[PDB]
Design a protein around this ligand. Structure first.
Ligand SMILES: CC1(C)CCC(c2ccc(Cl)cc2)=C(CN2CCN(c3ccc(C(=O)NS(=O)(=O)c4ccc(N[C@H](CCN5CCOCC5)CSc5ccccc5)c(S(=O)(=O)C(F)(F)F)c4)cc3)CC2)C1
Length: 144
């Protein structure tokens, strides 16, 4: 549901901020989902470190331009459809935007980015997720 999805976003973003030595104080099957997502994001960031790195020096964020940048990238990422990989890449993108934000003393973006990710998950990705077995399938596929 929509609250679940909000939980996932906050867990993932806190995880990424913790890893990089920042504060996240701008904030059981569910535990299994969260664990699989953390690991998949790390794995994604490892295999696609080139793409990851290219994007993290590409855009310059301000509180005034953040939302249009977030939306362009997300629309590009899902232009041709949804799959699980693309969903993991979506979470990683969010994580990278938050980390960049805290770096540049734009802490206010962190919770805005969380809510933009939850909204997009709940409006645009959730239908595809329920159709494809829900988050249980994602956990089975990642660990099988
Ligand atoms: C246009 C633009 C610039 C826009 C913006 C932008 C962009 C740039 C930076 C950032 Cl930051 C964000 C976005 C791009 C850049 N990029 C390029 C990379 N892109 C993809 C590459 C491959 C797939 C794919 O393959 N999709 S997939 O077939 O569904 C699939 C396959 C395998 C696994 N999993 C394995 C797990 C193996 N482990 C072994 C160890 O032990 C445990 C299991 C591999 S890790 C793994 C592998 C792949 C994905 C995730 C994790 C999973 S998965 O983890 O989701 C699962 F399994 F389903 F859970 C799902 C999907 C997309 C998409 C976009 C382009």
């Amino acid at each position: 549901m929509s609250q679940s999805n909000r939980e996932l976003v906050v867990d993932f973003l806190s995880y990424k901020l913790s890893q990089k030595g920042y504060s996240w104080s701008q904030f059981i099957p569910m535990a299994a989902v969260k664990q699989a997502l953390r690991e998949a994001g790390d794995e994604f960031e490892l295999r696609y470190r080139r793409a990851f790195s290219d994007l993290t020096s590409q855009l310059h964020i301000t509180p005034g331009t953040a939302y249009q940048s977030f939306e362009q990238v997300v629309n590009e990422l899902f232009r041709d459809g949804v799959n699980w990989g693309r969903i993991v890449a979506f979470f990683s993108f969010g994580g990278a935007l938050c980390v960049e934000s805290v770096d540049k003393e734009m802490q206010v973006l962190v919770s805005r980015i969380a809510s933009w990710m939850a909204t997009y998950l709940n409006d645009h990705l959730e239908p595809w997720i329920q159709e494809n077995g829900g988050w249980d399938t994602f956990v089975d596929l990642y660990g099988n």
